[PDB]
Amino acid sequence: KLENQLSFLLYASSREMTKQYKPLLDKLNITYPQYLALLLLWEHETLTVKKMGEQLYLDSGTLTPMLKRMEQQGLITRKRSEEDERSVLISLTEDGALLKEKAVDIPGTILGLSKQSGEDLKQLKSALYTLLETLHQ
Amino acid sequence: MKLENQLSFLLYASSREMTKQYKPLLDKLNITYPQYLALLLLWEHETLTVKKMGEQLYLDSGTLTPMLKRMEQQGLITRKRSEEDERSVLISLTEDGALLKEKAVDIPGTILGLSKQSGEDLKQLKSALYTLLETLH
DNA sequence: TACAATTTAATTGTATACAATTTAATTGT
DNA sequence: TACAATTAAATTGTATACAATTAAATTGT
């Protein structure tokens, strides 16, 4: 079959979840990944591009262009690290930081959909953390 | 509102991490993960319409038209207009596309092997994701 | 301590995803 | 006969993903 493949599942369910964020994220005028970078920025006003990649499991290949868009949109600003001219520093603009106020309804909203399943999702999450540690050395 | 505590993020990271596990295996068959998925449907069903593939794969022409074009150029599949509905398109396996099945034989094995390190049986993990998928749909 | 391995981003090239629009074919009573 | 409304792929425009390569800025011996 196909629905019996763990990889597929993770793959199609993840793309469906994203479609659920679409109406919400259109509100804030951002994409799901930009949104994920913001969840970081909101807990830490500034971060090296390296740090973001590490936490989101993406690399310069994605972040470089994605951070450019966010910058061109006014949600962030970027500058070279002065203690290490090799890395780049990403910082929230006032807007970027304010935008957090408008995204507080999201988790609960998504949950009002996902938890609509039936079993403890705090279980599924726990699993995925490990799986993630596995698949990530 | 910490990133690492979002089911949405976990599905997204884990999925792409699994896809990285397939890369070495699929590289030897000269295809990609999404291509591999369409072939899975094709090895079990000689002919499928673009529409049925979209349905089974949770995709639409947009991701499929370009992908199936590459596969056709790779000599894996044929694409002919349906006679029963000149609006539909039928996707058929080629001798080469068909032979390819055998070389993907122990891919599931290798995957399962490098992943069964979770804090529970895949039967549950899979069933969890299956439910979450059904819901979000 | 000169400077060859090493690291961090940007750059290149290929391949999804998906909304929105378009085009051609088919359908509801 | 008719057709407005659907429908199924393509197509257009934007936005990721990621491997490999490149370039510049630390590191380690």
CB B78 within 8 A of CB B92: yes
Cα A130 to Cα B92: distance, rounded to the nearest angstrom: 39
Shortest Cα distance from A32 to chain B (angstroms)? 9
Indicate the residue of B4, B18, B58 with minimum beta-carbon distance to A10: B18
DSSP for residue B84:
S
Domains, chain B, with CATH or none? 1-137 (1.10.10.10)
Is the Cβ atom of B42 within 7 Å of strand D at any atom?
A: no
Resolution (angstroms) stands at 2.6
Assign 3-class secondary structure to A85-102: CCCEEEEECHHHHHHHHH
B99: number of Cβ within 10 Å: 11
Is the Cβ atom of A60 within 7 Å of strand D at any atom?
A: yes
Tokens representing B54 are: 């979209």
Shortest Cα distance from A86 to chain B (angstroms)? 26
- Decide if B133 and A40 are in contact by the 8 Å CB cutoff: no
Instruction: Identify, with chain letter, the residue nearest to nucleotide D16 (CA–C1').
Output: A62
Shortest Cα distance from B20 to chain A (angstroms)? 8
Q: According to the entry, how was the structure determined?
A: X-ray
Indicate the residue of B3, B12, B122 with minimum beta-carbon distance to A6: B122
Indicate the residue of B44, B111, B131 with minimum beta-carbon distance to A117: B131
Tokens representing A26 are: 């259109």
**What is the biggest distance separating any 2 CA atoms in chain B, rounded to whole angstroms?**
53
Residues 6 or more apart whose Cβ sits within 8 Å of residue A100:
A38, A42, B1
> H-helix or E-strand containing B22?
helix B7-27
CB-based contacts of B112-117 (< 8 A; 24+ apart in sequence) = B112/A6, B114/A134, B114/A135, B114/B21, B115/A6, B115/A131, B115/A134, B115/A135, B115/B18, B115/B21, B117/A130, B117/A131, B117/A134
Q: How far is the CA of B102 from the C1' of C19 (A)?
A: 38
Residues 6 or more apart whose Cβ sits within 8 Å of residue A129:
B4, B10
- Decide if B136 and A113 are in contact by the 8 Å CB cutoff: yes
Q: How far is the CA of A26 from the C1' of D14 (A)?
A: 14
Residue closest to A95 by CA, chosen among A119, A121, A76: A76
